[PDB]
From Swiss-Prot:
Chief site of localization: cytoplasm
Keyword Transcription regulation: yes
Record-given protein name: NAD-dependent protein deacylase 1
Cofactor: how bound: Binds 1 zinc ion per subunit.
Residues holding Zn(2+): 124, 127, 145, 148
Ranges in coiled-coil conformation: none
Gene name in the database record: cobB1
GO-annotated cellular components: cytoplasm
Organism this protein belongs to: Archaeoglobus fulgidus (strain ATCC 49558 / DSM 4304 / JCM 9628 / NBRC 100126 / VC-16)
Length: 249
């Protein structure tokens, strides 16, 4: 939290952010990897891939319905609140997230790109049709599409599946013009999301990493803050807001 970092943020021309599961950990939602990560307790091979869904849609749906309830009942934390505020202040231009929760939105963030989909969305496996839900469905029975008599599935991106072209292209455009990118709460291993911060660096921008652990991105991060996103972002945005308020205008 040195003056150099604060200056980089407060004076940025087009700051964007990329967030991962770590930004929602302080909301009581576990992450995917690490200590008590979901992929350490559960097997992604039976829950997060098209083959697993086709093999046992009931098992996959029961798990996602559980995750949905957990997310819908959770509250945004200080990190989510801080990103929303950084956007309100006119500093953060776009928030790109790998998270399938809607905590960024519930905290007030407006320009959000969901690279991996959302637990709020459910769609048909047959016809190209989707819609959002207010609460989690009960499983069984299997959620069915009332547009062609087929199965509905969680509107999230599974391993091996292609991220929607329009979504990734938009995110790509955002990082192509960003001069600063805050990368918070992500392990930087899952592609193509992990490649986004590299674009910023290759084009001449700065990377500000926020994570209690070091990651594959750490070596090229201009700044790498070892701490929880809630604490770090709250302090960072408060200092940025203060700095901006001091400007003679
Ligand atoms: N309070 C916290 N504040 C900031 N970061 C934290 C916090 N707590 C944990 N982290 C960090 O969050 C990171 C989470 O890494 P992942 O669990 O791999 O989450 P993510 O990078 O978003 O996963 C990417 C993708 O893979 C999953 O299969 C899924 O599709 C997901 O979107 C870890 O590096 C971890 O150290
Ligand atoms: Zn359908």
């Amino acid at each position: 939290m040195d003056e150099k970092l604060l200056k980089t943020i407060a004076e940025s021309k087009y700051l964007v952010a990329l967030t991962g599961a770590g930004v929602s950990a302080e909301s009581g939602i576990p992450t995917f990897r690490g200590k008590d990560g979901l992929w350490n307790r559960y097997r992604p091979e039976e829950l997060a891939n098209p083959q697993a869904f086709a093999k046992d849609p009931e098992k996959v749906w029961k798990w996602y319905a559980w995750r949905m309830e957990k997310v819908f009942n959770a509250q945004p934390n200080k990190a989510h609140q801080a990103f929303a505020e950084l956007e309100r202040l006119g500093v953060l231009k776009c928030l790109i997230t790998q998270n399938v929760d809607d905590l960024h939105e519930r905290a007030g963030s407006r320009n959000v790109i969901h690279l991996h989909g959302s637990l709020r969305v459910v769609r048909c496996t047959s016809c190209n049709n989707s819609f959002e839900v207010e609460s989690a469905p009960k499983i069984p029975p299997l959620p069915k599409c009332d547009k062609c008599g087929s199965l509905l599935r969680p509107g999230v991106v599974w391993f091996g599946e292609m991220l929607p072209p329009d979504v990734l292209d938009r995110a790509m455009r955002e990082v192509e013009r960003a001069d600063v990118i805050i990368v918070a709460g992500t392990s930087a291993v899952v592609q193509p999301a992990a490649s986004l911060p590299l674009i910023v660096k290759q084009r001449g921008g700065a990377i500000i990493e926020i994570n209690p652990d070091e990651t594959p991105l750490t070596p090229i991060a201009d700044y790498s803050l070892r701490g929880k996103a809630g604490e770090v972002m709250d302090e960072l945005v408060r200092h940025v807001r203060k700095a901006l308020s001091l400007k003679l205008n």
